[PDB]
């Protein structure tokens, strides 16, 4: 009972309240002394919970631990031993994002006089010592350097004045390592490839520049909240604890490190001239601010309303254009490559909640950011343009589809395939998918009708206007009657690789079920047997897709759901879809968005399929080994169907890369002959959609290295195509030798 | 910590289906492992296509069942959405609930699962009971409320 009174009392310290933060900590520390005789065991694991799970409130809880230690030396030692215990647990379990929070906590405890600075310097020079380890991934060296550098904003001033002869040895080792790192992969992870207005810097190079500037600034940083400074008198007499010598858990093959990152930057101080001056990109204040806001989201992402309140109530020890930091952090996550920390739709609803809570400030910062993203689309990463499209359309659908389109009227004068007009076209198609065609024609200015989507109506080949001279017109009219007569399958068989039998069957079935998705899925299920018969040939599957497209080419949403349903019901397979995406009938729609949504949706189905059957094998293996014959015989049959699913996976990627290499090279010869530049807008999208394949599924494609290098991406290919493959090799190389 | 594990959008609502076959205990059991959501406060003109586009943003949709008026057999202003996995329905519960569709705030609730007869409004006129006691005029909800 009083435990619950202790927990909620520890978690809520430092929130909004009448009393000052220092008065609350001094008071709380006093009641934790009283209850400590009885509840020492529980108070200990609660403080270990918040040090692990609440890094945003870091300095609040280190001060609290600092007060208890000054008054109770044996409690301070038990706590530090628990931290060392947990830091080893985390590194063993490959939870490195959680381990940095513990290192950072240990480091800040030095300011609280709980840990002696020499012990902390010893641990850090064992961190940087990982740079000397040989036959280990760069991502391992990167993380241990990051844990050191990212703790210095809090503990930097103290460690340097106390020991600067051994700190400079550490800095010298750090700078040596940073200069010899390979940055060949950064382009795949940048949201914009342009260096202006804001370069997208590799995260360690950014952090390094930030720490060195803090060093030249005499380790004076004006953002971190340091409550322990008011308790100097109490904390000067405290007895320090010495950390044991730290040994980094060795690198095994099961080790998983955080992959590299690029710092998202779209704001400087000129974007909010009236207001608190914005910390620069190379200031550690910018680093701490964003790190904390990212952590607030990580803690409260599941509750949108709470998450927004915690972002708005974020305390600093100096004022900052907070609305600009929030928007930038939220877009930094939505555009993070390869994938955002959380599901994408969360960021749309989090921004609405923020608008509700700051209706006079945030909505116009958000709108200012939307204009900026639009104006920088030229070099925006295609994976990020897609997320920008999906967010903006979903955002607008929650705000009456109201937008100042006139501000973007200058895209009407450009090539329709340029980034801005293509962005607007995709946005309006997404808005239609959330509303309906006529609504979108009414809300856009009359000058934007060229970017509006075609009306989504099916095209029936054997309709009234059709000529009786068309092949199979007669049979098409027989099917049209039999379907409405509720005819069974065999009757349809008698009414009918033959392309025309597929053509008349599909044309008629889709036409008669066009009212909704429910009717189309019902039709496929009722006559499923028919599909499997005349579409068993691989070229038959291809022709089902070809015909289905001819009917619904004006309704991209219907095409995606039908392709999805036919895969799940085994009418077509993933290889048929892959070959369909690159067929000539889709060449005009190739650059459009819905095509790549379909392809990626098909890949995700394959990938999810392999994982399911791998877990079966990775369960039966557990039963045999954990329990301990007949089980080994069942394992032999699982492994056989793990291999068969893994080879269809590999074939799906090899088809995609083949067709990609083919359409790209033949475009490169067509440009060489005609004697013209290679960079077509079409070319930009194509080459970037190739890079998207490597980037989205880099963990699976890693298995195909030798095949890809030796059979597909070879010296003979144009240097423009190899450039993409070598970026992908640089990426996987950073995390694997 | 209790605060960090908190999922206040995923918890069950006070609504319970009276036509459900069983007692409260086993209905609550079905709710907590259900992948199906009840979607309320829809415009009578909202189509299956619009619901697919919105609700797909949290995961893959297995089936959608539009609610109908038992007599007229027309859109009744609600539907059900069945996902393949529950995590996807949970995310629709957190982020899609309380947002707009056809410019109306929609409300999602966990459902015990679809069985025949649930697609029809239980109101005396054939529509939802919600629309029998309504006073204000609503264009997307079919005028006044008797």
């Amino acid at each position: 009972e009083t435990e619950d009174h202790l927990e909620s009392l520890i978690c809520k310290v430092g929130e909004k309240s009448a009393c000052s933060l220092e008065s609350n900590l001094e008071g709380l520390a006093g009641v934790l002394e009283a209850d400590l005789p009885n509840y020492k065991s529980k108070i200990l694991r609660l403080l270990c919970t918040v040090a692990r799970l609440l890094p945003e409130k870091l300095t609040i809880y280190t001060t609290l631990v600092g007060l208890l230690n000054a008054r109770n030396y044996n409690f301070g030692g038990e706590f530090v031993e628990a931290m060392i215990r947990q830091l080893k647990e985390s590194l063993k379990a490959n939870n490195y994002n959680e381990a940095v929070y513990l290192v950072r906590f240990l480091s800040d405890l030095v300011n609280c006089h709980v840990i002696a600075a020499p012990s902390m310097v010893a641990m850090f020079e064992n961190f940087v010592s990982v740079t000397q380890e040989e036959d280990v991934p760069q991502v391992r060296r990167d993380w241990y350097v990051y844990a050191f550098l990212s703790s210095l904003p809090w503990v930097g001033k103290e460690l340097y004045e106390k020991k600067d002869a051994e700190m400079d040895r550490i800095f010298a080792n750090t700078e040596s390592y940073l200069k010899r790192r390979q940055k060949t992969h950064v382009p795949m992870l940048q949201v914009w490839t342009a260096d202006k207005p804001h370069p997208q810097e590799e995260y360690l190079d950014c952090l390094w520049a930030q720490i060195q500037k803090l060093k030249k600034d005499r380790w004076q940083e004006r953002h971190i909240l340091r409550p322990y400074l008011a308790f100097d008198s109490i904390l000067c007499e405290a007895l320090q604890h010495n950390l044991p010598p730290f040994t980094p858990p060795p690198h095994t093959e099961d080790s998983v490190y955080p992959m590299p990152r690029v710092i998202f930057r779209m704001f400087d101080y000129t974007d909010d001239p009236e207001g608190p001056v914005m910390p620069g990109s190379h200031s550690v204040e910018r680093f701490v601010i964003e790190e904390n806001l990212h952590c607030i989201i990580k803690s409260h992402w599941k509750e949108r309303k709470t998450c927004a309140a915690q972002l708005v109530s974020y305390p600093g020890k100096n004022k900052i254009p907070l609305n600009y930091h929030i928007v930038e952090v939220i877009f930094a996550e939505l555009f993070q490559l390869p994938a955002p920390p959380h599901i994408d739709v969360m960021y749309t609803t989090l921004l609405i909640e923020l608008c509700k809570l700051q209706p006079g400030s945030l909505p116009q910062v958000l709108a200012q950011a939307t204009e900026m993203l639009y104006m920088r689309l030229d070099t925006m990463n295609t994976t990020c343009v897609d997320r920008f499209i999906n967010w903006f359309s979903h955002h607008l659908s929650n705000f009456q589809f109201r937008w100042s389109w006139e501000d973007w009227s200058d895209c009407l004068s450009q090539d329709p395939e340029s980034p801005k007009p293509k962005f607007v076209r995709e946005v309006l198609e997404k808005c239609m998918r959330l509303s309906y065609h006529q609504r979108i024609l009414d809300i856009v200015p009359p000058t934007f009708s060229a970017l509006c989507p075609v009306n989504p109506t099916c095209i029936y080949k054997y309709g009234d206007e059709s000529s009786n001279s068309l092949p199979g017109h007669s049979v098409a009219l027989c099917l049209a009657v039999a379907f409405k007569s509720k005819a069974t399958n065999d009757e349809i068989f008698s009414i009918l690789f033959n392309p025309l039998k597929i053509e008349v069957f599909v044309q008629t079935l889709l036409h008669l079920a066009a009212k909704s998705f429910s009717h189309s899925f019902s039709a496929l299920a009722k006559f499923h047997e028919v599909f499997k018969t005349l579409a068993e040939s691989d070229e038959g599957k291809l022709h089902v897709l070809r015909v289905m497209f001819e009917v619904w080419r004006n309704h991209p949403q219907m095409i995606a759901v039908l392709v999805d349903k036919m895969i799940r019901t085994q009418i077509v397979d993933c290889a048929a879809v892959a070959n369909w995406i690159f067929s000539s009938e889709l060449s005009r729609d190739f650059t459009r968005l819905f095509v790549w949504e379909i392809l990626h949706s098909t890949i995700r189905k394959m990938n999810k399929h392999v994982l399911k059957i791998q877990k079966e094998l990775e369960e039966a293996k557990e039963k045999l080994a954990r329990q301990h014959g007949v089980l080994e015989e069942q394992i032999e049959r699982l492994q056989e169907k793990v291999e068969s699913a893994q080879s269809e996976q590999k074939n799906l990627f090899l088809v995609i890369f083949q067709r990609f290499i083919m359409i790209l090279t033949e475009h490169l010869v067509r440009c060489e002959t005609d004697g013209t530049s290679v960079l077509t807008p079409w070319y930009k999208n194509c080459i970037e959609r190739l890079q998207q394949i490597f980037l989205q599924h880099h963990q699976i494609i890693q298995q195909y290295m030798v095949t890809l290098e030796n059979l597909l991406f070879t010296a003979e290919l144009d240097p423009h195509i190899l450039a993409v493959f070598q970026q992908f090799c640089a990426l996987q190389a950073a995390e694997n030798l | 910590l209790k605060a960090l594990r908190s999922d206040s959008y995923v918890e069950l609502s006070q609504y319970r289906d009276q036509h459900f076959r069983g007692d409260n205990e086993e209905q609550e059991k079905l709710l907590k492992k259900s992948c199906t959501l009840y979607v309320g406060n829809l415009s009578f003109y909202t189509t299956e296509e619009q619901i697919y586009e919105l609700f797909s943003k949290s995961g893959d949709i297995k089936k959608i069942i539009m609610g109908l008026d038992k007599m007229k057999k027309t859109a009744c202003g609600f539907c059900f959405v069945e996902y393949y996995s529950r995590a996807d329905a949970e995310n629709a519960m957190r982020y899609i609930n309380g947002t707009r569709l056809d410019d109306r705030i929609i409300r999602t609730d966990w459902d015990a699962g679809f069985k025949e007869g649930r697609q029809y409004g239980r109101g005396r006129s054939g529509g939802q009971v919600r629309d029998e006691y309504r006073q204000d005029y609503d264009a997307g909800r079919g005028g006044y409320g008797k």
């Binding site: 619950d4 009174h5 927990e7 909620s8 009392l9 809520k12 310290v13 929130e15 309240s17 009448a18 009393c19 609350n24 008071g27 709380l28 006093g30 009641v31 009283a34 | 209790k2 605060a3």
Partner: peptide, 19 residues
């Protein structure tokens, strides 16, 4: 969850006055 839904001041001031 009786404690869980309270204000920080309410809890801190209840702990040191009561016991």
């Amino acid at each position: 969850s009786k404690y869980e839904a309270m204000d920080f001041d309410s809890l801190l001031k209840e702990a040191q006055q009561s016991l």
